[PDB]
Structure 1
């Protein structure tokens, strides 16, 4: 498990907020950021559609150009962000309560490396 920390937007309540979080990897020098929005899909299921940037560490500023990978992640419950979320890769995460400023913490387990 690595800790995650982020926020969900609080501007309107007329939609399901966008959100972003950072996973602060505890087994490597990398960081990953996720950003997305929660939807009620056509079948009634909550879905988090996110995209992510995975930042690797480099030792030389001249290698900076190759340090960022990008991709998607769709999470389904195991539209409050709070709870447990799973993915098809087998990765999963837990999000705690969202407070009045829209902040939340959680934990992330990656099935893949």
Structure 2
């Protein structure tokens, strides 16, 4: 259940992850298929840790949108023939005032398979 490689999800988005070093880490690019203003979508980075020990490991990473102010974070698990990432996310928008915070965070799921 190597997280390296090229994956796609059910909302059409695609990602690529670099090599995983043995202390958990990976780097990747994210191309989102869907967005708040898909007038402005580009390639966004992505930093994350993944257990290297259990064969169906938990994990988590961070996407940093280069086209807006928000952050999306993902956790989930890889299962086995074929590998499937079951994930969930929080998409945090930026609000101008802290008193506005309550409406900043959304949540959702996604399912990834290799390409």
TM-score (norm 1): 0.62
- 1:42-92 CA distances to partner (integer Å, 9 max, x unpaired)? xx21100000000000001011000000000100110xxxxxxxxxxxxxx
- In the other structure, the counterpart of 1:30 is 70
- In the other structure, the counterpart of 1:19 is 59
Q: CA–CA distance in 2 between the matches of 1:66 and 1:14?
A: 36
For structure 1, the 5+ residue unaligned runs are 79-113
Q: What RMSD in Å do the two structures reach over aligned CA positions? A: 1.0
Q: What SS is found at the alignment partner of 2:76?
A: strand
Query: Following TM superposition, where does structure 1 have runs of at least 4 consecutive aligned residues deviating by more than 6 angstroms?
Result: none
Count of aligned pairs: 73
For structure 2, the 5+ residue unaligned runs are 1-42
For CA contacts below 8 A with separation 6 or more, give which structure has more relative contact order: 1
Q: How does 1:1-113 map to 2 (within 5 A)?
A: 1-10=43-52, 13-40=53-80, 44-78=81-115
Q: What SS is found at the alignment partner of 1:22?
A: strand
TM-score (norm 2): 0.61
Change (3 A) 1:14 1:58: closer
